[PDB]
Symmetry: C5
Subunit: 25 residues, 5 copies
C-alpha cells in the first residue's frame, strides 16, 4: 500500500525533525 | 490514512516553527 | 476532503522553509 | 487535481531543502 | 501514478533531512 509507505516516511521525517530540534537546542 | 497524514503534517509544522524560533 | 488540508499544511511548510532560508542568508 | 498540487508542493519542499543543505554546506 | 511521485519525493526529503543531520553532527 502506497499510503502506508507515505505514513511511514512522514513518521521518519517527524523523527528526523525531532533530532534536528534536539541538536539545535 | 488521511488522518495520519494530517496529524503528522501538523507535528511537522510545529517542529518547523520551533526550528524557526531557534534560528531567530 | 482532507486533500485541501494536506495542501494547506504543505503550503505552510513551504512558507516555513522560505523563512528558514531567509534566516540562514541573513 | 489535489494530487498534482500535493506533488508540486513536495517538489518545492525538496528544492527548498536542497537550498538549505547548500547554505549549511 | 501520483502516489509513486509522492513516495519518491518523500524519500528524497528523508535523504535531505539525513544530510542535514549529518551536517549538524559534523
Ligand atoms: C530552488 C533553489 C535551488 C536549490 C539549490 C541548489 C543549488 C544551490 O547552489 C546555488 C549556487 O549559488 C551559489 C551560492 O553562493 C554561495 C553560497 O553562499 C552565498 C549565500 O550568502
Ligand atoms: C533530490 C536530491 C536528493 C539527494 C540529496 C542527497 C545529498 C546530496 O546533496 C548534497 C548537496 O550539497 C551540495 C554540494 O555539497 C557541498 C559542496 O561544497 C562543500 C565544500 O566544497
Amino acid at each position: 500500500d502506497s499510503q502506508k509507505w507515505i505514513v511511514f516516511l512522514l513518521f521518519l521525517i517527524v523523527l528526523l525533525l525531532l533530532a534536528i530540534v534536539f541538536l539545535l537546542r
